[PDB]
Symmetry: D2
């Protein structure tokens, strides 16, 4: 007899799960995730902000790195997200349980997070993770100021409907540094043209390349560091090769155009 298949776990390259110590980006901003997944800690005189958590199993590691940075569970005030896929919002439910953190997200990201990434537009139920509730819904261009660090939301729908770039100005050498944490612009295996679950997908991606291109962007970071040419394992040279927002947007668009062409042929 042939039974139905076993459930399949969402497995990822080992590097995405490889713990790293905190890597400083600017005076208040640290990469505290893994070698190949971004989780940004921003430390304020009025508590901390986390942008992304990576995979579900990273919760304790993130907590460890926060502790090394001087941040206790009570000190974590806000979680922001690029997009609510398992490899970026994975540990959010657990972080909410174990810290003081509240989540702010747009409606699309909130709805996807609340269903734990199940019924994904492209990936079905294959990337389900523990669901969490958003505490605050943000609109496009809305600001959240935490201890004078002002975070601005820039919607960049495509990779998910709720995909968001987050921007803020930190310092280095008494000089302002405009950090752009731009979301993914990939469409891996997606049906792009005439997708019934996402009829305006192509229009949304096109608008998003333009949005990303135009961001205040002294330093670009991305959920997958490779997408912006960061190498978190490279120490003092980790960001040396980083793309500009312009170059990231252009590369993503050129890739997308190729994908569209391949789809038409397939």
């Amino acid at each position: 007899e042939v039974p139905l298949p076993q459930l399949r776990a969402y497995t990822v390259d080992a590097s995405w799960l490889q713990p790293m110590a905190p890597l400083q980006i600017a005076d208040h901003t640290w990469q505290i995730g893994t070698e190949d997944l971004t989780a940004l800690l921003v430390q304020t005189p009025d508590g901390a902000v986390l942008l992304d958590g990576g995979m579900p199993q990273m919760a304790s590691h993130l907590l460890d790195n926060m502790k090394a940075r001087g941040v206790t569970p009570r000190d974590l005030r806000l979680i922001l997200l690029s997009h609510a896929h398992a490899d970026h919002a994975g540990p959010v439910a657990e972080l909410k349980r174990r810290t003081g953190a509240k989540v702010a997200a747009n409606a699309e990201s909130a709805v996807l997070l609340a269903r734990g990434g199940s019924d994904d537009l492209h990936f079905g139920d294959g990337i389900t993770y523990p669901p969490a509730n958003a505490d605050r819904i943000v609109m496009d261009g809305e600001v959240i100021t935490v201890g004078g660090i002002v975070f601005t939301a820039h919607f960049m729908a495509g990779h998910t409907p709720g995909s968001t770039a987050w921007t803020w100005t930190d310092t280095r050498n008494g000089k302002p540094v405009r950090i752009a944490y731009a979301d993914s612009l990939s469409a891996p295996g997606y049906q792009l043209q005439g997708n019934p679950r996402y009829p305006h997908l192509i229009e949304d991606y096109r608008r998003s390349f333009a949005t990303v291109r135009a961001l205040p962007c002294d330093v670009l970071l991305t959920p997958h560091p490779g997408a912006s040419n960061w190498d978190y394992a490279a120490g003092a040279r980790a960001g040396a090769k980083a793309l500009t927002c312009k170059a990231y947007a252009d590369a993503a668009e050129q890739k997308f155009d190729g994908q569209l062409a391949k789809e038409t042929a397939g």
Copy 2:
């Protein structure tokens, strides 16, 4: 280097995933799940009721069996649950999307279902599944009548806080048959004594053995058919060896007492 572990899928014995054709229990009541997981279809002149769905991957199989029984997606009106673990409520979200079915459950089951079984009192995040919302909250002893089949809820907290027995009266040979679909009474690997997440666990199990013992119970069925000595693969003899509610309750209590003793020693 040592990366964090990959996520682990909730895997189960093959028999739990082995499709079977509909097996009739009484005039209106059919087992439509797998060889080792119960999913009961109750067919009414006013639409159908499903009690449990088994594992997440069983959704399509259940839909196939409903079709064989004369039940289209539109005809499925109500889903009831024993308890909201992945191996019983697994396909509920998908069934809601693909049919007309609404879910009725107690508060505890609703809350656990809404978080997709994540943050389980005993199993942590190991048995997460797609979350779903309950459409109706039921109280202990509350009835839901569907086309003259009256279903009564009997709370039997223990295996989960929201564990419920469902009872209804069907017919065979113009004679009433009082069917008791009693939930699990196991506590696999549970910390029973002084559990901070479930301080009254032992008291709740004791009350539940008494509840199960007293059910109107011409025929007992259970989420795992083996627990009540059903053999779904045995055709005309499938229920021949079935326990009474009294015997099921007594066996569960004797097992529980042994577990309590082993725990004290361990």
Copy 3:
């Protein structure tokens, strides 16, 4: 002493609460709400669709009109919404409890509906109503076909972030009739310029006037019938004076421009 003020009820002009009998718009489409609030019943060989319900207290009236049309609670399959304010989505929770109806809405409308219209961007908590959950999230341009009546979503953010026009093709005289149920385009008392809760409000309204202008639109209907020059109390002449989508959009834009000017002056 001065106590805090009593809670204030959301009160409305009497005409918004004045029951009317079903008024036919096309072969399958009926106005079944009140004299001054639209609630559209669309009747299909495969069940019925309701677009809007009006105020919370209209639930029973709507049920009465459905019954007069041949539609039992079981027959109501789908609820669609213009926007999730109390005067349009008011009875949705109750309708879900009392019928087979499931709700399909965009993420913004779902989030606002789920909080019962509380924490409104402009109206605070003044228009709270019973919350309800969406069963299906729709994307811009997505279709929902019910018994061959195909409903297309057209996002028209402004009045609320989740404001939606719904379009479908019915018949009259063996001729197709393209019905456009366009949402409100008002901004009553709203802060339009530099609104921190809605930074791109003006851009969204401008885009929405263009969206409405371009709809397939043999017949325009609106949540407040007066907005499209319908007079539901006028019998055979109820729609005689109805605006085109073009004229509705233009009037709304001219009004909006005046409001923007008044705001700058104020």
Copy 4:
């Protein structure tokens, strides 16, 4: 013509809305609500806890009193609830938005809070308020320790399914003071016998009188101070006349027995 009735606001005696300054109960515990609604602030070296908020319109007043006590919005860590009716959990949604506070409640209270008290077992939709999500679900007898103040949940179902007494030990004069914040035990206008929405109502009330009777209870407080003979307007004598838990339970039971008799006659 006769339109449907306007929505009716939930109005209350003026005294329930009469602001008062903080009134100290024990070293760490203050009444910060109104003259006739309890809202208890418990202040810890590790942040503050609020038990109840009273009516929806009390949010700002509570925030004012917290400020007078040395408690900023960031310092408020936890909200606990007696039961999730509008006159006790009314401002919870707003408090969550305006402070760092997370909510811990049992499943029943969470479900009722999440629907903003709509579809109440006895009161229909008449007492709807802004909905809020619970951050943590508590079981009967579960403890939540905040800065060494240990709060224990004691379920006392009846007034609502999720009705809870909260107990903790504070100090006065270097002596322990066991504070019992016991929920309401009233059943105003309720159908007690054979209520289809609450079939075991009488059994639950009986169990709850016994639970309340047995609480660790040097000092009893109740959501409506009059129920335990507190007079918050009486300064140094505010609690002089307070009932014991035993006397509160007995009075509630005697009242309940009278109600049951009146119901049988009616």
